[PDB]
Amino acid sequence: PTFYDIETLKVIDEEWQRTQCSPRETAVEVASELGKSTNTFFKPPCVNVFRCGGCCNEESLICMNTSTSYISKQLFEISVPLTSVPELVPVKVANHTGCKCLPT
Amino acid sequence: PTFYDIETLKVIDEEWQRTQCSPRETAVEVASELGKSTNTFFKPPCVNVFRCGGCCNEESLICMNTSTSYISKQLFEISVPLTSVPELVPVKVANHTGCKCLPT
Numbered sequence: 001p002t003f004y005d006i007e008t009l010k011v012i013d014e015e016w017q018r019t020q021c022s023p024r025e026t027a028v029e030v031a032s033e034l035g036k037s038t039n040t041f042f043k044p045p046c047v048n049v050f051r052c053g054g055c056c057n058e059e060s061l062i063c064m065n066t067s068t069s070y071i072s073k074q075l076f077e078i079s080v081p082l083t084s085v086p087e088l089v090p091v092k093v094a095n096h097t098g099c100k101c102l103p104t
Numbered sequence: 105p106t107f108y109d110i111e112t113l114k115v116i117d118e119e120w121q122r123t124q125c126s127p128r129e130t131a132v133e134v135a136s137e138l139g140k141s142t143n144t145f146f147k148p149p150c151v152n153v154f155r156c157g158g159c160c161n162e163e164s165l166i167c168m169n170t171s172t173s174y175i176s177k178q179l180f181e182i183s184v185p186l187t188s189v190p191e192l193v194p195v196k197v198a199n200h201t202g203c204k205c206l207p208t
């Protein structure tokens with residue numbers, strides 16, 4: 001075990017660690033998380049919340065949220081066509097606060 | 105258009121911008137990007153590369169890579185069972201360097 005050897009391996013592990021199941025910030029399209037009837041739009045269409053992702057030690061395991069809170073995010077509801085008026089509505093979208101690899 | 109009004113809207117747009125199609129760093133499981141025959145493992149199993157994602161202005165559009173480079177990432181190949189020895193191999197994994205919303 002030379003000294004140059006260690007550093008690289010180290011670094012590779014840090015790589016491996018940064019890929020592990022955690023709540024990472026992601027872009028969620030609000031339509032796909034609700035009923036979305038009769039072409040009631042959103043603007044903006046998407047929102048930045050934290051979500052679970054990343055790899056697991058064993059294959060059968062998956063990154064699943066173990067806890068979740070719900071942020072409120074002001075958005076414009078546009079029903080086009082057509083009317084009248086889009087209003088500033090606070091929609092509740094799931095922020096994942098806990099994760100763990102699980103079955104499945 | 106009051107002054108408090110502006111700030112919030114501003115901020116919401118910045119939200120909207122941060123969700124738009126771009127190359128964002130993500131965790132790729134190396135098995136799923138190759139042949140993966142006869143249970144030839146990897147360790148670590150995953151790797152941090154840049155990939156395309158995010159929302160698009162219109163619905164029919166998707167974030168697609170328009171350019172891609174290929175990073176080389178030293179990994180351990182373990183064929184278990186079983187032998188012999190896992191060796192430090194440089195695998196070539198796709199780093200997305202360009203994106204744009206497209207059809208589809």
Ligand SMILES: *[C@@H]1O[C@H](CO)[C@@H](O[C@@H]2O[C@H](CO)[C@@H](O[C@@H]3O[C@H](CO)[C@@H](O)[C@H](O)[C@@H]3O)[C@H](O)[C@H]2NC(C)=O)[C@H](O)[C@H]1NC(C)=O
Nearest residue numbers: 032033034035051064065066067068069093094095096097
């Ligand atoms: C893990 O996070 C997900 C979000 O990705 C959570 O799923 C959500 O769970 C809530 C609460 O059960 C669901 O709200 C429900 O919606 C139904 C019908 O759409 C409504 O009738 C109920 O009254 C309720 O409000 C929501 O649908 C669901 N969202 C999804 C899956 O898209 C889940 O709760 C989280 N799980 C853990 C372990 O915390």
Ligand SMILES: *[C@@H]1O[C@H](CO)[C@@H](O[C@@H]2O[C@H](CO)[C@@H](O[C@@H]3O[C@H](CO)[C@@H](O)[C@H](O)[C@@H]3O)[C@H](O)[C@H]2NC(C)=O)[C@H](O)[C@H]1NC(C)=O
Nearest residue numbers: 022023024025049050051068069070071094095096097098
């Ligand atoms: C949405 O979920 C994200 C992540 O799941 C939440 O961010 C997390 O907030 C918690 C709050 O306790 C942070 O815990 C602590 O953070 C401080 C930061 O200095 C740290 O010193 C402590 O050791 C501890 O970790 C956590 O770090 C943070 N995670 C990330 C990645 O930002 C966020 O709060 C959730 N949104 C809301 C408002 O519920």
Ligand SMILES: *[C@@H]1O[C@H](CO)[C@@H](O[C@@H]2O[C@H](CO)[C@@H](O[C@@H]3O[C@H](CO)[C@@H](O)[C@H](O)[C@@H]3O)[C@H](O)[C@H]2NC(C)=O)[C@H](O)[C@H]1NC(C)=O
Nearest residue numbers: 136137138139155168169170171172173197198199200201
């Ligand atoms: C967008 O990025 C993707 C990666 O997610 C690129 O897909 C990859 O394209 C390369 C080059 O065509 C493929 O390599 C090929 O593999 C086949 C068989 O597996 C081999 O026979 C060929 O000789 C070649 O080396 C690779 O399979 C493919 N990877 C995927 C899709 O998982 C794609 O090139 C990028 N597109 C743009 C617009 O740059």
Ligand SMILES: *[C@@H]1O[C@H](CO)[C@@H](O[C@@H]2O[C@H](CO)[C@@H](O[C@@H]3O[C@H](CO)[C@@H](O)[C@H](O)[C@@H]3O)[C@H](O)[C@H]2NC(C)=O)[C@H](O)[C@H]1NC(C)=O
Nearest residue numbers: 126127128129153154155172173174175198199200201202
């Ligand atoms: C893998 O792809 C990522 C992103 O697709 C590459 O990161 C990007 O690298 C380019 C190199 O030109 C950066 O462009 C310039 O970055 C400097 C940073 O100070 C900035 O001042 C310039 O305005 C310009 O944007 C780009 O920012 C950067 N993107 C991110 C999000 O990091 C990365 O280089 C690719 N891996 C390899 C080695 O091919």
